[PDB]
Design a protein around this motif. Sequence first.
Motif, PDB file in Angstrom:
ATOM      1  N   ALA A 110      28.786  70.034  49.283  1.00  0.00           N
ATOM      2  CA  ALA A 110      29.018  70.929  47.848  1.00  0.00           C
ATOM      3  C   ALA A 110      30.528  70.706  47.343  1.00  0.00           C
ATOM      4  O   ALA A 110      31.639  70.117  48.289  1.00  0.00           O
ATOM      5  CB  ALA A 110      29.033  72.186  48.333  1.00  0.00           C
ATOM      6  N   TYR A 111      30.520  70.797  45.985  1.00  0.00           N
ATOM      7  CA  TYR A 111      31.882  70.665  45.357  1.00  0.00           C
ATOM      8  C   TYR A 111      32.053  71.966  44.424  1.00  0.00           C
ATOM      9  O   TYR A 111      31.084  72.795  44.191  1.00  0.00           O
ATOM     10  CB  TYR A 111      31.611  69.390  44.097  1.00  0.00           C
ATOM     11  N   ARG A 112      33.313  72.336  44.489  1.00  0.00           N
ATOM     12  CA  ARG A 112      33.745  73.455  43.906  1.00  0.00           C
ATOM     13  C   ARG A 112      34.268  72.939  42.481  1.00  0.00           C
ATOM     14  O   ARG A 112      35.158  72.212  42.216  1.00  0.00           O
ATOM     15  CB  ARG A 112      34.749  74.214  44.542  1.00  0.00           C
ATOM     16  N   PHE A 113      33.878  73.513  41.051  1.00  0.00           N
ATOM     17  CA  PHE A 113      34.543  73.172  39.755  1.00  0.00           C
ATOM     18  C   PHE A 113      34.640  74.431  38.912  1.00  0.00           C
ATOM     19  O   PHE A 113      33.405  75.272  38.673  1.00  0.00           O
ATOM     20  CB  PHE A 113      33.532  72.299  39.056  1.00  0.00           C
ATOM     21  N   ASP A 114      35.662  75.098  38.824  1.00  0.00           N
ATOM     22  CA  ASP A 114      36.077  76.327  38.153  1.00  0.00           C
ATOM     23  C   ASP A 114      36.242  75.939  36.804  1.00  0.00           C
ATOM     24  O   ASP A 114      37.010  74.741  36.517  1.00  0.00           O
ATOM     25  CB  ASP A 114      37.154  77.231  38.753  1.00  0.00           C
ATOM     26  N   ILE A 115      35.758  76.788  36.049  1.00  0.00           N
ATOM     27  CA  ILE A 115      36.092  76.414  34.385  1.00  0.00           C
ATOM     28  C   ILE A 115      36.837  77.699  33.657  1.00  0.00           C
ATOM     29  O   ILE A 115      36.835  78.668  33.760  1.00  0.00           O
ATOM     30  CB  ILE A 115      34.687  76.442  33.841  1.00  0.00           C
ATOM     31  N   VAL A 116      37.858  77.470  32.970  1.00  0.00           N
ATOM     32  CA  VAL A 116      38.710  78.277  32.272  1.00  0.00           C
ATOM     33  C   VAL A 116      38.555  78.178  30.777  1.00  0.00           C
ATOM     34  O   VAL A 116      38.856  77.106  30.231  1.00  0.00           O
ATOM     35  CB  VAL A 116      40.235  77.963  32.642  1.00  0.00           C
ATOM     36  N   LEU A 117      37.905  79.406  30.200  1.00  0.00           N
ATOM     37  CA  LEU A 117      37.867  79.405  28.732  1.00  0.00           C
ATOM     38  C   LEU A 117      38.970  80.210  28.099  1.00  0.00           C
ATOM     39  O   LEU A 117      39.725  80.851  28.910  1.00  0.00           O
ATOM     40  CB  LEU A 117      36.603  80.055  28.266  1.00  0.00           C
ATOM     41  N   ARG A 118      39.386  79.943  26.922  1.00  0.00           N
ATOM     42  CA  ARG A 118      40.416  80.708  26.168  1.00  0.00           C
ATOM     43  C   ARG A 118      40.311  82.357  26.504  1.00  0.00           C
ATOM     44  O   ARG A 118      39.319  83.032  26.717  1.00  0.00           O
ATOM     45  CB  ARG A 118      40.066  80.603  24.415  1.00  0.00           C
ATOM     46  N   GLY A 119      41.814  82.772  26.665  1.00  0.00           N
ATOM     47  CA  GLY A 119      41.834  83.961  26.989  1.00  0.00           C
ATOM     48  C   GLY A 119      41.200  85.168  25.657  1.00  0.00           C
ATOM     49  O   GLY A 119      41.556  84.851  24.752  1.00  0.00           O
ATOM     50  N   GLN A 120      40.918  86.177  26.157  1.00  0.00           N
ATOM     51  CA  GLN A 120      40.123  87.034  25.231  1.00  0.00           C
ATOM     52  C   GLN A 120      41.019  88.406  25.297  1.00  0.00           C
ATOM     53  O   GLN A 120      41.169  89.012  26.371  1.00  0.00           O
ATOM     54  CB  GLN A 120      38.820  87.406  25.736  1.00  0.00           C
ATOM     55  N   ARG A 121      41.422  88.925  24.353  1.00  0.00           N
ATOM     56  CA  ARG A 121      42.297  90.146  24.179  1.00  0.00           C
ATOM     57  C   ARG A 121      41.863  90.984  23.095  1.00  0.00           C
ATOM     58  O   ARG A 121      41.088  90.697  22.190  1.00  0.00           O
ATOM     59  CB  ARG A 121      43.855  89.762  23.935  1.00  0.00           C
ATOM     60  N   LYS A 122      42.150  92.287  23.105  1.00  0.00           N
ATOM     61  CA  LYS A 122      41.950  93.357  22.170  1.00  0.00           C
ATOM     62  C   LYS A 122      42.950  93.237  21.162  1.00  0.00           C
ATOM     63  O   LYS A 122      44.006  92.659  21.191  1.00  0.00           O
ATOM     64  CB  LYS A 122      42.255  94.818  22.802  1.00  0.00           C
ATOM     65  N   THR A 123      42.230  93.482  19.965  1.00  0.00           N
ATOM     66  CA  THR A 123      43.398  93.397  18.725  1.00  0.00           C
ATOM     67  C   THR A 123      44.142  94.572  18.809  1.00  0.00           C
ATOM     68  O   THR A 123      43.965  95.545  19.710  1.00  0.00           O
ATOM     69  CB  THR A 123      42.635  93.638  17.114  1.00  0.00           C
ATOM     70  N   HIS A 124      45.282  94.231  18.225  1.00  0.00           N
ATOM     71  CA  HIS A 124      46.380  95.387  18.264  1.00  0.00           C
ATOM     72  C   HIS A 124      47.157  95.186  16.804  1.00  0.00           C
ATOM     73  O   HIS A 124      47.605  94.188  16.653  1.00  0.00           O
ATOM     74  CB  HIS A 124      47.403  95.207  19.427  1.00  0.00           C
ATOM     75  N   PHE A 125      47.660  96.294  16.486  1.00  0.00           N
ATOM     76  CA  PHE A 125      48.561  96.739  15.312  1.00  0.00           C
ATOM     77  C   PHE A 125      48.085  95.529  14.167  1.00  0.00           C
ATOM     78  O   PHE A 125      49.158  94.931  13.474  1.00  0.00           O
ATOM     79  CB  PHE A 125      50.084  96.240  15.527  1.00  0.00           C
ATOM     80  N   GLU A 126      46.996  95.276  13.932  1.00  0.00           N
ATOM     81  CA  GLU A 126      46.434  94.460  12.873  1.00  0.00           C
ATOM     82  C   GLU A 126      46.320  94.953  11.384  1.00  0.00           C
ATOM     83  O   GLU A 126      46.126  95.998  10.771  1.00  0.00           O
ATOM     84  CB  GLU A 126      45.137  93.771  13.221  1.00  0.00           C
TER      85      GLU A 126
END
Lengths: 233, 233, 233, 200, 200, 200, 200
Positions: free
Chosen positions: C217-233
Motif C-alpha cells: 500500500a501507498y498513501r497519497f493525500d491531495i490538497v485542494l484550494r482552501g474554501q472560505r465564507k464570503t465576508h464584508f463583500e
Amino acid sequence: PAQDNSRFVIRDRNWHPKALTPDYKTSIARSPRQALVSIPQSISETTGPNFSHLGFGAHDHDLLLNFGLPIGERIIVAGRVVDQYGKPVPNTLVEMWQANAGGRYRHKNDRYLAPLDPNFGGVGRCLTDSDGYYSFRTIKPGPYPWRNGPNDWRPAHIHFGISGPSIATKLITQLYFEGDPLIPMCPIVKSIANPEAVQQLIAKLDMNNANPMDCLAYRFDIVLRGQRKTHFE
Amino acid sequence: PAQDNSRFVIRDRNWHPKALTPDYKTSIARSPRQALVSIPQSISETTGPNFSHLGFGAHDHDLLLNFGLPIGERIIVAGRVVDQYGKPVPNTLVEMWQANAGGRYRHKNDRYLAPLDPNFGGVGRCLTDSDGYYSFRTIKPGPYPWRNGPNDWRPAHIHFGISGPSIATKLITQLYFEGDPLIPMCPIVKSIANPEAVQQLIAKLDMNNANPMDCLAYRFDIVLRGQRKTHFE
Amino acid sequence: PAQDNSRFVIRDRNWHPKALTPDYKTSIARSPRQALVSIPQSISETTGPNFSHLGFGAHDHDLLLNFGLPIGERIIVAGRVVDQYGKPVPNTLVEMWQANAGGRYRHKNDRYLAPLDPNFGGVGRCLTDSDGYYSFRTIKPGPYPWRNGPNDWRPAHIHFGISGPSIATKLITQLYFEGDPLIPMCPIVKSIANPEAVQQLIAKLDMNNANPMDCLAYRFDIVLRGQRKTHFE
Amino acid sequence: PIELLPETPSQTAGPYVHIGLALEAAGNPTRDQEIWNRLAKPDAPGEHILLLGQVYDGNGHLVRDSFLEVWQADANGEYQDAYNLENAFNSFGRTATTFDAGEWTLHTVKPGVVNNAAGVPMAPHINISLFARGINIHLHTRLYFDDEAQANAKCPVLNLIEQPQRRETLIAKRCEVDGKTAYRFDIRIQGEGETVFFDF
Amino acid sequence: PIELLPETPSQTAGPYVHIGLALEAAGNPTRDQEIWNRLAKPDAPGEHILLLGQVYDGNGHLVRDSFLEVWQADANGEYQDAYNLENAFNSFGRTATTFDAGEWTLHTVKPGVVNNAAGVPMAPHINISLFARGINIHLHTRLYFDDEAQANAKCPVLNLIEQPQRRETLIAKRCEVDGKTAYRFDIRIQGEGETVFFDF
Amino acid sequence: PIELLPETPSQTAGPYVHIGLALEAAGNPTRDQEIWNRLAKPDAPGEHILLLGQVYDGNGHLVRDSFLEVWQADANGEYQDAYNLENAFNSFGRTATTFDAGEWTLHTVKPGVVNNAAGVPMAPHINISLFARGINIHLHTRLYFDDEAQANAKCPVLNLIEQPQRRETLIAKRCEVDGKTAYRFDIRIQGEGETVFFDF
Amino acid sequence: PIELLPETPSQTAGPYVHIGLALEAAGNPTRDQEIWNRLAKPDAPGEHILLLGQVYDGNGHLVRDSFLEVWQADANGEYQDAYNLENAFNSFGRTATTFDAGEWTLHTVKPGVVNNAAGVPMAPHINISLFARGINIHLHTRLYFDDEAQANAKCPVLNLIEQPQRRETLIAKRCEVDGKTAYRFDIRIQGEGETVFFDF
Ligand SMILES: [Fe+3]
Ligand SMILES: [Fe+3]
Ligand SMILES: [Fe+3]
Ligand SMILES: [Fe+3]
C-alpha cells in the motif's frame, strides 16, 4: 458477541525490548530460543474483554484512601490512552501497582529492610473516560535494591497494565519519573535498545494539573497498537 | 589439470553477514554454534572449475526469449566481475534466477496468489567476456511477502551465483534496485551489519546502456576475493 | 440549484508548473503567449457538480477485478482529500488511469512494444467518504519511453482527476512512487520549479495499510484550494 | 594499513535456489547442458562409488531445500578443471536434497591423494559447500572415508581439528546400495554431533 | 514511508505482579469484584473442564511467579466480550502459579469452533498470554485438546507450524482430577520441548 | 504572513486521458453510467442547441487529443449541481476532440442569465476548461453567443478584457447543422487570434 | 544512477570560423590539402548534381557567415569514410555562405538508399550540420529531393515528424544551373517555415 471487524498494526519487535537481554539476569533462562511463529489475525486475536460492567469501588483509583494518610510525596498520575493513529481508547482498563515511599512492596516475598506503611496498599485501577483519560492519586514510590548485579537499584517506578480493544493490544509496562539519575543505569530499562523508546516511559512533571498546597502531578500518555478496518480481504 | 599457484585474500567475516541473525528467523536453527576451523590454503581450495566449454544456448542470458513476451518492465542487467585488486575475471560463470513482475516464482513451493506469467521462466546464465563483462535481458521482479514476521516483504531482487577462479572465490548473493524503500526494512538485507556493505548490493539505474523506446538498464559490478601469487612460501 | 456562498483561496501559479517549459517539447506550441486575465469569483466559478448520485459499479475502484488476475505488484492506493485549511472534502469525485506493469496503456495510440495484459484495463473511480477518504486497488504501473528527448522515460505514475466542491478546485495531476530514480530526470516532473512542490506528488510506502501476504500500500493525500465564507463583500 | 576493494557481501540462496541451479529438481524443463550429480561416466578410471546423505538443522529436523556443490581430484589425485559433459570425469558437481525424503546423491570415483602446500599428503577427501535458505554465507566442509583409517590418521587438515571427537564428524560410513559401494555422509549444522565447517 | 506514533514499549511485570493483578495470591485483601480463574458458573452450558499446568524455564526449573491471562469462545463458538461477574460464562480470565507447587488452575468449558478470516474453522483452542519476572514482553500461545485430533489435523493455525513435532507442544493432555475431566498444559519457555509462541 | 497548506501541483493530463475520462473515445468498453456530451434530454426546457469547435496550437495545427469540461446554467439561469443521468438537464458535461477530424460537439440548451457577486447580470455564457498533453495546468475560458450582442456589451466579465479585439475571441458564431441551431467556437491556444484565458 | 565523464560543452564558432575551416573564404592562403565543397570527381559514378541554398535568420535576413558540413552515402548507398583527395568520391564536405550573396554550393552525386537500424530503407538524403556566430550548439538537419516523392513518403525518419507541413521544409527543389541538374535547399532558422532540426 464480539466480531472480527478490525486489524491491528503489526508490533515493531525492534522497538519493544528483545527477549534475551543478558544484563537482566533472569531473562537468560526465561526467553525462548526458537523464533516466534507469525500468524494472520482472526476473531481470536482481534477481540478482547470490555470492562464497562465491572463494579469499581469509589476509591479504586485513590491510593491515598483505598487501603490515616500514607507518608510520602502526594502526587496525581494522569494521562490519555490513544492508538498509533492518535485515536482515543475509551472505557479501557488501566491497572497499576507500586512500592511505598521507601521502596517496600506489600507482598510476602518482599524482604527489603525499608518498612511497610500501615496506611498504604499500592494498588489502583481506573476505566478510561470517553476521551481516553485516566487518573490516579498516590505517593511517589522510592527506588529499591534488587539482586541482579551486586549493586543494582530500580529507579522509582509504577507498574502499568492496559487492556485496550483486544488481546492483541494488551500491554504491561512501567512508568519512570522525569530526571531520575537511576534511569540510565537500570538493566531493565536497558532491555530497550532505542533511547527514543526509553523516553516514552518517562512521566513528565505537570505543574498545570497540580493542586496548590496539596499535591504535585505527573503526565503519562500511553500508545496502543493502531486499529484499522479490514479492506480488500 | 589444475595447479596450486595462487593465494586468495582472507575473507572479512564481519563484512559478510554473520551466520546467526535472529531477525531472519530461519537462521536460528540453521547456523553453527561451534566456531569455524581455519585451514591454510592448498590446491584443494585454490582451484575450481572453468566453464569455458559448457555448451550455452543462444538465449541462455535472455529471459525475454528463453522460456509471447513477458509482462513487466523490460531491463538489461549488466556489469563487470573483478577481484579485490581490481583485475577483471574473464570467462567466469554468472547464474541468475528471479520472480516474475508480480513477485511469483516458477517453483512448486511458491503459493503466493500472484499468477505465473505464461511467457516467463526466470533463469539465466552468462559466461563473462575477456574483460570481465556480463549482461542479461529480463523484466524487473516484483517484491513478495514471506513468512518471517507478520508483515515482511522482500524488496525486488535478482538472485546471483558467481564461480570465479576457484571454490575459494565462489559466491551467492542478491541484487537490489536503487531507491527501493523496502531495502532498509528487510531482515535479510539487515543480516549485513555495515550499511556500507549494503550499498554494494544496490544496482544503479544506467541510462547510458538503455535502448531508447525499448528497455532501461541497471549496472551491477561484482568483486570477488583478491588473487595473488604465492611468495616466500 | 447551486449558490454563491464560498470564496476559494487564489492559486499560486509559481507553485504549479508554468505553461511554457521548453524541455517538455509539446508545451512550446500549446502554451498561451498572452497573460491570463484575472476575474473576480462569481456563482459561475464557485459552484460545480456533485456526483453523489452517479451510479458507481461495485468494482469501479478495483482494477484487479474491473476489466484471470492481472500480472504485477498488487497494491492499494489510498489517501485523503482536504482543502488548504485542512478540512476534509467529502463525497468528491476521484478518477484515475494508468498503464499496465510493463508501461503499456490500453489505448489505440499506444504502440509501445510491451504487451497489453488481457486481464487489465487501467481505469478506476471512487467517491470520497464522509472523512475525505478514497482507496483504489491496482497494480504498480511500469515506466515507459516517450518521444521527447532521444532517451526520455516517464517514472512509474498514476494519472488523477479530482472534482472538489467547484470548477475552481477541479484538478488533474500525477502520482509518483517513493524512491523512483526516474523522478529527477523527468521533464514533465521538472515543469514544477520548486522541489518542495515535487515532493507533494510522491506517494509513500504505507506498510500499516498493507494486507500481509497479499498486497502492499501507498498513501497519497491531495490538497485542494482552501474554501472560505464570503465576508464584508 | 592497505585496504583493497571490499568483496561483494554474501546473501542466502533462498528457498527457490533450484530454479536457477537445479532445474530438474525445481520440476522445470532443463537446458541442453546442465551441471549435475554425475561426475564420472561408467567408463571413467577409478573405483566407482555412490555418495548419499541428509542435512539436519539444530532441532534435528531435515533441511529439505539444501543445495550442494562438490570439488574433488580424479583417481590419480589430479584436479580436472576443464568442465565438459563429454569428459569421462569432471572434478565438479552439484546435488540437492529431496523436498520429500531429504537425501542427496552423487555418482563419482574415490579421489586419489593430494599434497598440501608443504608437500605433506592429505587423506582422500571431497570438498563440499552447502547452501540453503537460512544460511547467509555458505558452509565449507570435507568428506573423508572410513576405509582410509591409516591415511586419515595422518591428514594435516584433519589434524588441525583440536578435539579428536570432532574429527569423526567428517568421516563417511561405507555401505552398499544395490550391491554397489556407497558412503553415507550426514551433515548436522547445529548442536549434537555438529559437523566441523572450515574457513580458508 | 509512513510512520505512525510508536507503541509504548513493554517492560517485565516483575515478581510482585500479584499485588496488582492477583490480590488473593499476593496474600492481600481483595476488592468487591476481581477478575479471576472461574470463567464458568456451574450452570453454564457446555462441557465443564478443569485446566492445570506448570511453567518451566530453560534449566527445567519451575517458574513460580508467573501470571497468565486467557481468552476463549463459549461452548457455541462465541466470544463473550461484555465482562460481568453476573454472567454464567465469561470469555476472559486470569490465573497464576503457586509460589509453592508452581501450578495454575482454571475452571471453564471446552470452547466451540470459530472460523478464521478466510472462513476456515479452527480447532477448539484457548488463547494464552504469559507474563513474569524475566519476561520483557508477554508470550502468546494456544492450548488445543488431544481429544480433537480430527479438527487439530485440519487447523489453519496449527498448520502454519512448519515442523509437525512442534505442533504437539500445543496439545493439552486429557486427564482426570478428583474424577473430574481435566487437561494438563505445561509450558516450556526454553530448551527441549520448547513451546510454540506466536506473533500477531 | 500566514501560509496555509500548499495546493497539490497540477500535471498535464497526457495523451491517454481518454481511457480515464472519455472511455468511448479511447474506444474502450464503457461503464453503466458515464459523464458525456449531452447536457439536455429532448424534453428539457429552453432552446436546444448544438455546440462544436476545433482547437489549434501555435502552429495553426489541430490538437486532436484535447479534453474539455463544461459548466453552465439551465435556461432559467440556474446551476443544477446534483448530477444525475435521469435529469432532463445537467449543468456539467464532457467532450473531446476526434483523433481524426479533431472536432468536439456538445448538445445542450442556451443558458439563462446569472448575476455576478455585485448583483450585476452576466451575458449568457458557458464555462470551459481545456486539458491535453503539452498543457501543464488546464486553461479556463468562456463561450459567449454572437446573437447576444446587447447582453455582451454590458457583461462585467467581458468588460474586464482591456482590448475590445480580444473580447471577440470569446464569441461563438451562430450557424445551423441539419437545420439545428448551432454555434461554432474554435479555440486558438497561441498566436494570431489567441483566445482569452482566465484566472480565478 | 551511473554518471559518465561529462562531454565538453559546445561554444559558437564565431564570425571568423572561415580562418580555421574555410581558408579561401577567409581570403587567406590555403594549405596543400583542404577539405572543401567538391565531393565528387567528374568521373565519380552516379548522377552528378549541384546543391545550392541560402540561410535565413528569424527576421528573414540572410546569414552571411554560416559554415556547413555534409555527410552522404555514395551512388551505391555506401558511406565512404576514408577521406582522401585522390578518391573519386568522398562522403564528407564543407561549404560556407558568401559574405556578399550569402549562398553556398556543393558539387556531388545523388546518394543511394541506406537502411535504418530496423532494416527499413530511408529516402536518399544528405545529413547537414550548421555552424555560425549566434549559434551556441550546431543544428542538425537533412536534405531530401523533391523528385523522390515515393521514397519520401515511406521514409521512417520523415515519418517521425508530427505535422506533415513541417516535413516539406526538408525537401530540396530540383532546378538547373547552366543546364546542370541542381537542387535548391534554403534553411530558415526561425519563424515562418522554420526548418526541422534534429536531435540524435
Ligand atoms: Fe527470492
Ligand atoms: Fe517493581
Ligand atoms: Fe501516463
Ligand atoms: Fe574568437
